[PDB]
């Protein structure tokens, strides 16, 4: 994606993820959390892993569906 | 903080609050339970009724002529003057001393002479 070959481990795609919680949950927890604390990183919780950890709906499947309904509904 | 945001606000006199509380009392009477509102609303309605110095239309017209009379006054102190309805210089002096302005006696006399009409 970034113009260079990247692995799928902690030094590749997961390592350059913008989410702090997703990075810390996979392989390296202490180092990623401390590095985020040093930089004052902000996690926007736009991913799936962070929403799973918190307990919020994931942005996939039915989580991206928005519903509307007209209130004056009668049988 | 009521709601998400506030669009507009307005300062009303005692008579407008009395009319609104009477409307709410009628709405509560239209409801099935015999209690129209809670203790505070009923107490406010009773106080406004016992201090109903002027009609709501009279209060509104006094407010708009007060707005059109002078520019340094605002809606809040105009409604305060409508509710108090002063008749001399001592009361207006002691209610304007703590305000941001200290008006000279001539404009106070003018205010007295315009609010003298349609008074009880």
């Amino acid at each position: 994606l970034d113009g260079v070959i990247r692995p799928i481990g902690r030094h590749g795609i997961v390592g350059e993820k913008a989410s702090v919680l997703a990075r810390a949950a996979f392989e390296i927890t202490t180092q990623h959390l401390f590095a985020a604390a040093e930089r004052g990183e902000v996690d926007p919780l736009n991913g799936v892993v962070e929403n799973v950890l918190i307990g919020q709906p994931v942005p996939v499947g039915t989580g991206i569906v928005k519903l509307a309904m007209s209130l004056p509904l009668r049988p | 903080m009521i709601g998400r945001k506030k669009l507009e606000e307005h300062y009303i006199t005692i008579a407008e609050a009395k009319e609104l509380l009477e409307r709410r009392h009628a709405e509560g009477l239209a409801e099935n339970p015999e209690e129209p509102m809670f203790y505070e609303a009923r107490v406010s309605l009773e106080h406004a009724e016992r201090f109903a110095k002027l009609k709501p239309e009279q209060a509104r017209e006094l407010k708009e002529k007060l707005m059109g009379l002078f520019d340094w006054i605002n809606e809040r102190i105009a409604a305060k003057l409508v509710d108090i309805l002063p008749e001399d210089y001592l009361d207006i002096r002691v209610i304007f001393a703590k305000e941001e302005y200290m008006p000279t006696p001539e404009e106070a006399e003018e205010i007295i002479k315009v609010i003298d009409e349609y008074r009880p």
Partner: protein, 97 residues
Amino acid sequence: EGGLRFGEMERDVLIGHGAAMLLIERLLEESDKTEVWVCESCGHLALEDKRRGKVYCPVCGEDERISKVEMSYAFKLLLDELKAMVIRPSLRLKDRV
């Protein structure tokens, strides 16, 4: 009388099926659902005093702007562990609608 573990792989198949509400019901609603008070000023966890019947944030104050947020108890334990590790997590609250 223990329960059955819903591991990471089970979460993976639930995600692949696109069932967000089922994931919420399994991992959160049926396992460790709890509610906490979060301060809206500094993001710290507010304190609820049962003696006085009031909720306030001890570090910053803010006796008024306190909101209740539901989440897993494991996440609260993680926040406590992070605070014990001299790391400050600031929870920025957002309206549901």
